[PDB]
Amino acid sequence: VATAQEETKQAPGVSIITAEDIAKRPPSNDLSQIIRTMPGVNLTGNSSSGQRGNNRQIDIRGMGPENTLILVDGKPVSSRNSVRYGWRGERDSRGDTNWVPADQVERIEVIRGPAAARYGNGAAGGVVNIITKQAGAETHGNLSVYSNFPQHKAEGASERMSFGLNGPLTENLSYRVYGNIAKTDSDDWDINAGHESNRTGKQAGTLPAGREGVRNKDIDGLLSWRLTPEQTLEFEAGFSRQGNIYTGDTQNTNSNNYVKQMLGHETNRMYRETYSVTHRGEWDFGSSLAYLQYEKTRNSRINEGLAGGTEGIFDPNNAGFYTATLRDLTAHGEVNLPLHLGYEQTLTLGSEWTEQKLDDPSSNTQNTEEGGSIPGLAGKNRSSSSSARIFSLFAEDNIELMPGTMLTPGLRWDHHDIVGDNWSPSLNLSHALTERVTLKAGIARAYKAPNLYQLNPDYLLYSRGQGCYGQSTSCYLRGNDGLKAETSVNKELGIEYSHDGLVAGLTYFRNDYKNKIESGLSPVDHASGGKGDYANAAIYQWENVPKAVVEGLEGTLTLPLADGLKWSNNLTYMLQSKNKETGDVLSVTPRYTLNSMLDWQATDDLSLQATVTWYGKQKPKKYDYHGDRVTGSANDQLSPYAIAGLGGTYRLSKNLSLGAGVDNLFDKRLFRAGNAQGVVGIDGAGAATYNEPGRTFYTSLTASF
């Protein structure tokens, strides 16, 4: 009997991307590009402001990217938690899917809804687990190189070069190492000129930036030592560095002179260092796994403001870099025990402990002189430091009820040192109706701890009125340590026909989303003192939005037209996404997304690929920061559109393949006009918040032994 962990990787809410899929749709740089084509996955911001809108990240079933937990070889990636979380729920972050280089990935696992809740904190949407190629019984290695070439030159081209080498040292000692260097160029500063929202006053000439660029350096070493036939001990260290290439991005799309000085410059750099020890054992009466991970993330970037329009724009009064540091510590143990009597079943016991320490000398520095002081909050020299610790125990049991039929109950208990106890129960069922048809169902309660910015009372944003809910008076936004965790009851009912390479399936999912954390709507208090008409500014906190809901359909259809010819489709359809308190939308996703590949292995040494992605309509948020129906261009929608691509790979030998193709064959292009709503002298842009890149040719070479 399979463990509950391996078994639940067979739910309809589960997708696998292989190393061979990566070869046939090679990503520019970030893996999000290919990860997003799975059913139930979008590439979206975290809320609906449209801020930092070219910085979109992986979203599972509309639940936001903060609810997508990224693992590498089963170990958490937490680095984006080192970037400032803004009034509107975005971070100036490119996300956490670009730390492992695409050509060293063996496979990617995407686990959605109820089969993912067992992973705990931050899996309310789901889990994406990036697995790296590993050593075997013989020295192996590869060299992979990529390059694209956009028709339009303003758009940023990507150059990417990686190697891997792996194999034996001793009989009982293996190594696996890789190194990657990559560069996606920034879009030209001016790429959105003519598409920018209307720009009055002093904001005349300001521009929504295109896509930011990134320089990557990744180096990983792994050493695998066989103590015994029954025990293995693995040591690994990782060093990654991303530095951007800045092209005019600012939270509000306003500008100043520091912005313009910095065009082309590196204005943020993220160093990520990972060390890990892993014990793995296969035994007489089961197996077991224990690991320790230390992740240290240094986020160095230029000081930005924290008030109204100055929020998220470089500040000339505090010019220069600062460094936020994230130390994240993760320990994990589990034993797997096959039990034979009664039913065939496999029981799994485990605990987990995590600590997140965050040092950030910049985000807590807003002073209170204009809006009046806030009892209990020092105006200067507040602490940089946050932390939270979670302890967790769990038990999952995968019970063969009769052959065909599997029932897999679990319980996880989580103790957060500030927020308290959480109980996440789960039930995952698969039953076989035929050699060909399988019914599956799942219900779990997933868990999300407040992030360290939401939770901190020293974290303080300010606006003179334009961001304030329900008024034009000055207001403050303040963290809250009395917050409850977000929980979500992720239901799924799904059915699948599968036979002779022919697959046809359709899943319904509903996630009932309790206590989503968001900026509050009522002032809890008022500050006293200050200057002029801004004196005695309102005080709001980060609050738990009591109930929200997402709902949709995942579908997939795969037919073998002939021996050498396969037609595949992944389908996402978003039925509902609602803050039930404000009736506004949680996330801006396309109404549907259909991904379609035709794969012809026309020859033994030649495969050809055609792809079509159809995106549906996209609607912006209906309400502004004040909470009032928006007006003008702020209502603009994106009409449905499709991106098509052709590509191929030619086997020159066993040891060498060429690849080449075209993304966006019909040069369908979109442009970021700004943010979804209007501010003073800056007309809204509704759903037009991102740059879709135009026709782009690409080539590739892979040599391997």
Tokens, residue 25: 């749709």
Residue 531 CB: number of other CB atoms within 10 A?
A: 11
For ligand 8SW, which residue of 373, 535, 681, 703 counts as binding (CB under 6 A)?
Answer: 681
589 binds ligand 8SW (CB under 6 A): no
Identify which of residues 95 and 308 has a Cβ nearer to Fe ion in the complex.
Answer: 308
364 phi and psi, to 5 degrees?
A: -110, 30
- Tell the smallest beta-carbon distance from residue 625 to Fe ion (Å): 10
Tell me the site size for Fe ion, rule CB under 5 A.
5
Q: Contact 222/235 with Cβ under 8 angstroms?
A: yes
Identify which of residues 472 and 522 has a Cβ nearer to ligand 8SW in the complex.
Answer: 472
Choose the contact partner of 153 out of Fe ion, ligand 8SW, none; CB within 5 to 8 A by kind. none
Task: List C-alpha distances in Å: 590 to 554, 575, 640.
Answer: 13, 10, 8
Query: Which window, 54-62, 300-308, 562-570, 689-697, contacts Fe ion (CB under 5 A)?
Result: 300-308
Give me the residue label for tokens 């509704």.
Answer: 686
Choose the contact partner of 680 out of Fe ion, ligand 8SW, none; CB within 5 to 8 A by kind. ligand 8SW
CA distance 16 to 24: 15
Identify which of residues 453 and 462 has a Cβ nearer to ligand 8SW in the complex.
Answer: 462
- Tell the smallest beta-carbon distance from residue 152 to ligand 8SW (Å): 29
For ligand 8SW, which residue of 465, 530, 560, 648 counts as binding (CB under 6 A)?
Answer: 465
CA distance 399 to 385: 45
DSSP reduced 3-state for 104: helix
The continuous run of DSSP H or E covering 260 comes out as helix 257-262
- Tell the smallest beta-carbon distance from residue 628 to Fe ion (Å): 16
Give me the residue label for tokens 């209906």.
Answer: 622
CA distance 77 to 447: 17
CA–chain centroid gap for 450, Å, is 17
Which residues have CB under 8 Å from 498's CB, separation 6+? 436, 437, 438, 504, 505
Q: From the DSSP assignment, how many helices (H) and strands (E) are in the chain?
A: 5, 32
252 binds ligand 8SW (CB under 6 A): yes
Q: Per CB under 6 A, which of residues 198..237 are in contact with ligand 8SW?
A: 201-203
- Tell the smallest beta-carbon distance from residue 559 to ligand 8SW (Å): 50
Site string for ligand 8SW, 290-329 (x = CB under 6 A): -----------------xxxx-------------------
CA distance 205 to 203: 6
Tokens, residue 489: 């009851």
- Tell the smallest beta-carbon distance from residue 203 to ligand 8SW (Å): 6
For Fe ion, which residue of 134, 139, 198, 466 counts as binding (CB under 5 A)?
Answer: 466
Tell me the site size for ligand 8SW, rule CB under 6 A.
19
- Tell the smallest beta-carbon distance from residue 505 to ligand 8SW (Å): 44
250 binds ligand 8SW (CB under 6 A): no
Angle at the Cα of 183 from the Cα atoms of 182 and 189, rounded to 5 degrees = 165
Identify which of residues 463 and 618 has a Cβ nearer to ligand 8SW in the complex.
Answer: 463
CA distance 74 to 353: 14
CA distance 379 to 373: 7
Determine the residue with CB nearest ligand 8SW: 308
- Tell the smallest beta-carbon distance from residue 255 to ligand 8SW (Å): 8
200 phi and psi, to 5 degrees?
A: -75, 160
CA distance 14 to 211: 30
CA distance 488 to 509: 12
Give the CA radius of gyration of the chain. Answer: 25
Q: Contact 704/143 with Cβ under 8 angstroms?
A: yes
Q: Per CB under 6 A, which of residues 435..464 are in contact with ligand 8SW?
A: 462-464
Identify which of residues 144 and 251 has a Cβ nearer to ligand 8SW in the complex.
Answer: 251
309 binds Fe ion (CB under 5 A): yes
Choose the contact partner of 254 out of Fe ion, ligand 8SW, none; CB within 5 to 8 A by kind. ligand 8SW
Identify which of residues 12 and 309 has a Cβ nearer to Fe ion in the complex.
Answer: 309
Q: Per CB under 6 A, which of residues 470..489 are in contact with ligand 8SW?
A: 472
Choose the contact partner of 310 out of Fe ion, ligand 8SW, none; CB within 5 to 8 A by kind. ligand 8SW
Q: Quick one: the chain helix, strand, coil %, rounded to 5?
A: 10, 55, 40
Q: Contact 373/366 with Cβ under 8 angstroms?
A: no
687 binds ligand 8SW (CB under 6 A): no
Tokens, residue 576: 């509902």
Task: List C-alpha distances in Å: 549 to 207, 382, 546, 687.
Answer: 35, 37, 11, 21
DSSP reduced 3-state for 576: strand
Q: Per CB under 6 A, which of residues 174..203 are in contact with ligand 8SW?
A: 201-203
322 phi and psi, to 5 degrees?
A: -130, 165
Identify which of residues 476 and 509 has a Cβ nearer to ligand 8SW in the complex.
Answer: 476
Identify which of residues 167 and 529 has a Cβ nearer to ligand 8SW in the complex.
Answer: 529
For Fe ion, which residue of 464, 478, 516, 672 counts as binding (CB under 5 A)?
Answer: 464
Q: Per CB under 5 A, which of residues 482..541 are in contact with Fe ion?
A: none
Identify which of residues 88 and 695 has a Cβ nearer to ligand 8SW in the complex.
Answer: 88
Identify which of residues 537 and 597 has a Cβ nearer to ligand 8SW in the complex.
Answer: 537
For ligand 8SW, which residue of 467, 505, 523, 694 counts as binding (CB under 6 A)?
Answer: 467
- Tell the smallest beta-carbon distance from residue 466 to Fe ion (Å): 4
For Fe ion, which residue of 308, 372, 647, 684 counts as binding (CB under 5 A)?
Answer: 308
Taking alpha carbons only, the member of 569, 660, 598 closest to residue 26 is 660
Positions that interact with Fe ion (CB under 5 A): 308-309, 463-464, 466
| Positions that interact with ligand 8SW (CB under 6 A) | 201-203, 252, 254, 307-310, 462-467, 472, 679-681
